[PDB]
């Protein structure tokens, strides 16, 4: 295939910096890890002088790849395995197209992810056996893919051992399961021979792990390899960001059965691990991937399992250090102060996402293979999921009946916080009949299936500031207020200095109205101080100006009629319908509002990109109604010197046929320029931004509706 060097890139360094190190057995390399002798071709040439500093974003550039083919190991396995050298920023849409039809990989039905320890790992004889049986049983059925880092060390090798065993002893024989290995190109020992500008496909890879020094050897039982590159040598952890994006894309943005979308189930299992495992778990849970932690594995598994049920407030700095000096004993001397306060924020973030985290207890709980824990995680993540509706949870039940677990399917039926209708069990009963399992059909037909701790700003203290490759300083819930001393505080200053005087803070400084609703706020030097605590950044970021940013997000409401005009009281209480809008390229709807333009009186988005030639009328009507909230939101764009403040005016229509009040509003509400407009029912799982669902929850209780 020659589609590569055409659609897949690799990264290199253009000039050498001469960093002051020795890099084990060597005399300086550049700053990257590669020696001046082999550091491309024009780096040693004096291409003028770009300075004396190293910045990755500045002088690393993409090039067509030269490392892809069919690796065949020397003598331990005479087989063919496909591999490719992708870069760090290749979009997660050409990688899927490369896997589907350039290797011959069919669409999977499960996306198991295995993360854990490396170069420091020793399973107990019983943990190894239970993990082997569970993984073999789970991968034996369905079409599961096993995403795992590729190297000949630790759990990444002891997963390949089980794959090899199941592929050597099987009725269908050969290999019926697909195990993908994503690793970092820099940390590969014998990279030579694996690089050819056109492509070879013997790609012989002699495996020696005696003189590896510091570079891990590639595994020899995985089926496919995706080696990411960043232009760096000997630096692990590059593959952590790309792996989660690819997993999310394959899980929720590739299947189109039923005409809308389907989320392919995905789970991430944890077996021990270190610094690189906590980051992977945080990234996966942030994207929405369920995580299961095997208790007893050690060093990350015990640490996260021992605080998996405690309230987020009491997980403090000194609580980590007490649980970080028993599982990390030889490595405790490495642990510094600026790194413990980072291991704490990540653990707090993982714990507070309690709907995407299960713990596989060892002795007296889940006393079976890991499939029970996987089922529990999938069924708990499908019920608390936001975008895909009630039709998504209907298929993990089918997976459960495929795995012969009847107690797990019984638990979902009898849950008091899950409103399921009786005709919603057909896709599971259909599979129960096919598989000849009387237990499930007997369970179903019985249930009417007749045939005929602390409250601080959370999103403001969120990693990965939007639309920027920057990171915030880790600020745990303990030390967010501006009074508590945080001596390590050294946050970045990203803002898409110091003569900022003549700014009348706490007053209407010209046509800006810099007046916070939560009383007067303080100023440090020439910049304000964020109320409600710290964020982890500084400056202003992607915001108008320092201080409070004012907006006028409205909400509009009608009672949910169905067919007759009587208020359609639902199964529990009244439900009401909110009118929302969608951005042209976004995964969430938004409330019909925005910034208050000077002298506009309308929030610049109900006034533009929306209905026109009627602004004065509804403007004279909007100023009649009860406010439900006024002030600061937990918006993810906040910083230590800038924030967003809002007014929430609720307008309500009692009658659907109330003359032109609702008819003219509905008949005229047409963007004619924008992407899409719609109405939505107000439930606890509406796909809005969290800042908007907060207003919905705080205002739907003012009319008697059920959120
Ligand atoms: N993915 C890796 N493969 C091999 N060796 C590695 C890896 N990451 C770091 N190392 C090296 O091994 C030691 C670190 O071992 P651990 O602390 O156990 O590694 P951890 O930080 O848990 O990272 C393990 C990695 O494997 C996968 O789970 C995932 O890619 C994760 O980052 C150091 O010498 C380094
Ligand atoms: N309430 C919100 N919560 C989270 N992210 C938000 C929110 N509002 C906007 N965003 C994000 O802001 C980005 C969109 O920026 P613009 O298109 O400029 O829109 P704006 O409404 O001005 O913000 C996307 O990452 C999204
Ligand atoms: Zn370099």
Curated annotation (Swiss-Prot):
Residue numbers covered by motif Nudix box: 594-615
CDD domains for this protein: NUDIX_ADPRase_Nudt9
Binding sites annotated in the UniProt record for ADP-D-ribose 2: 585-586, 635, 637, 689, 691
Topology Cytoplasmic: residue spans: 1-452, 453-707
UniProt-reported outcome of changing residue 637 to A: Abolishes channel activation in response to ADP-ribose/Ca(2+)
Compartments where located: Cell membrane; Perikaryon; Cell projection; Cytoplasmic vesicle
Outcome of mutating residue 601 to I: Only slight effect on activity
Outcome recorded upon mutating residue 611 to G: No effect on channel activity
Expressed in which tissues: Highly expressed in brain and peripheral blood cells, such as neutrophils. Also detected in bone marrow, spleen, heart, liver and lung. Isoform 2 is found in neutrophil granulocytes.
Residues that bind ADP-D-ribose 1: 115, 120, 243, 274, 277
Residue ranges of domain Nudix hydrolase in the record: 558-702
Consequence when changing residue 236 to A: Abolishes channel activation in response to ADP-ribose/Ca(2+)
Quaternary state and interactors: Homotetramer. Isoform 1 can interact with isoform 3. This interaction decreases Ca(2+) influx through isoform 1 and suppresses susceptibility to oxidative stress-induced cell death.
UniProt domain comment: Contains two binding sites for ADP-ribose, one in the N-terminal part of the channel and the other in the C-terminal nudix hydrolase domain. Both sites seem to have a role in channel opening, but the interaction of ADP-ribose with the N-terminal site is absolutely required for channel activation.
Family listed: Belongs to the transient receptor (TC 1.A.4) family. LTrpC subfamily. TRPM2 sub-subfamily.
Annotated protein name in UniProt: Transient receptor potential cation channel subfamily M member 2
Taxonomic source organism: Homo sapiens (Human)
Phylogenetic lineage: Eukaryota, Metazoa, Chordata, Craniata, Vertebrata
Gene name of the record: TRPM2
